[PDB]
């Protein structure tokens, strides 16, 4: 059960609230683990740390011993040439059309011949769900078509670790059923490593191998989906079915109104 990412204990305050305090995670090789949880955790702010964008303050991130932000800037771009990442509201390279957005990381990392460079260019777009909407401008597209094109360039190079960030946000129930196949069908076929951040409990539990639910700064529930629902702590039971019982800020001010002046 050897892992790729070995998070040691972390503290992190970029909004001066409580975020991620003394937490340690491990991502086993060849497993689709979903990092769900409520709104009380930085959006992908965990995944920025594995990217090495924001700084672990008392953290310690070990990428197989090779430490992020102890390494070189040359090796980090060699390290960031291991990952594909669909963003939150998918950052497309505006202006450049659909034929150039997915061919962007292909051309950035060619290592074969001229033909075999162009061979994989026409081969990826048939490999994804495409090759007939090549030259449309990233102007005519919606949230359902945003992440669809964005997923194509995320899987462009075969990675050793690939992250997804809410792909199921603009999809129809047919095409998200295709997408839930399209995520995992790559995973058994190419033995890669996925990390999904999302909140849609039905298909996420039926696709993951180890989901972690974090409330504000700490784990609420970890493990396979069998034992996780079987060992629901009274934050996990409230998060499953969705029963309206929880310590969230439903109203912020819990003061009076009769004795409250109205400026």
């Amino acid at each position: 059960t050897q892992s790729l990412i070995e998070v040691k204990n972390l503290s992190f305050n970029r909004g001066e609230r409580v975020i991620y305090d003394n937490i340690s995670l491990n991502i086993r090789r060849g497993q689709i683990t979903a990092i769900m949880g409520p709104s009380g955790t930085g959006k992908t702010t965990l995944l920025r740390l594995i990217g090495g964008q924001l700084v672990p303050d008392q953290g310690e991130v070990l990428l197989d011993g090779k430490d992020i932000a102890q390494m070189s800037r040359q090796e980090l771009f060699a390290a960031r040439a291991r990952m594909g990442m669909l963003f939150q509201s998918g950052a497309l390279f505006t202006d450049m059309s659909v034929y150039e957005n997915v061919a962007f990381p292909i051309r950035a990392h060619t290592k074969l011949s001229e033909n075999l460079i162009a061979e994989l260019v026409a081969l990826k777009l048939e490999s994804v769900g495409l090759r007939g909407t090549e030259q449309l401008m990233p102007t005519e597209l919606s949230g359902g078509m945003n992440r669809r094109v964005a997923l194509a360039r995320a899987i462009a190079l075969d990675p050793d670790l690939i992250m997804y960030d809410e792909p199921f946000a603009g999809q129809d129930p047919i095409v998200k059923g295709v997408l839930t196949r399209l995520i995992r069908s790559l995973r058994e076929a190419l033995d890669l490593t996925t990390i999904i951040v999302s909140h849609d409990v039905p298909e996420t539990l039926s696709i993951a191998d180890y989901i972690y639910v974090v409330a504000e700064g700490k784990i609420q529930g970890e493990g396979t989906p069998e034992e996780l629902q079987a060992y629901a702590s009274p934050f996990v039971k409230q998060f499953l079915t969705g029963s309206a019982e929880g310590p969230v800020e439903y109203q912020f001010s819990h003061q009076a109104y009769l004795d409250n002046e109205v400026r």
């Binding site: 033909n115 075999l116 994989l120 990826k124 490999s127």
Partner: protein, 95 residues
């Protein structure tokens, strides 16, 4: 990686994009002296099918002879999972 002799051109072990250049044009150098193309490509030795396994194999035929003269055997039980991921039918020889 290495493509062999005894008339049969085999893909064996890996395709990893630092190669299949020197094995393409030298692997085609057998095919011009493979008349009517009875040569078989055993792809279940492939074991790393990743859409780069789709590349050079058909890149011989790009200028080769008959479109179904050159033969293939079968997927290595993972490449098929890419096939309906591209919604694909009978494409290559399924020996």
């Amino acid at each position: 990686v290495v493509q062999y002799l005894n008339q049969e051109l085999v893909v064996s072990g890996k395709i990893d994009f630092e190669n299949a250049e020197q094995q393409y044009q030298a692997g085609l150098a057998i095919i011009k002296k493979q008349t009517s193309f009875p040569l078989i490509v055993d792809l279940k030795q492939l074991e790393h099918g990743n859409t780069l396994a789709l590349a050079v194999l058909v890149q011989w035929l790009r200028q080769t002879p008959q479109k179904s003269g050159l033969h293939f055997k079968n997927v290595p039980e993972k490449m098929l999972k890419i096939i309906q991921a591209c919604h694909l039918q009978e494409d290559l020889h399924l020996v």
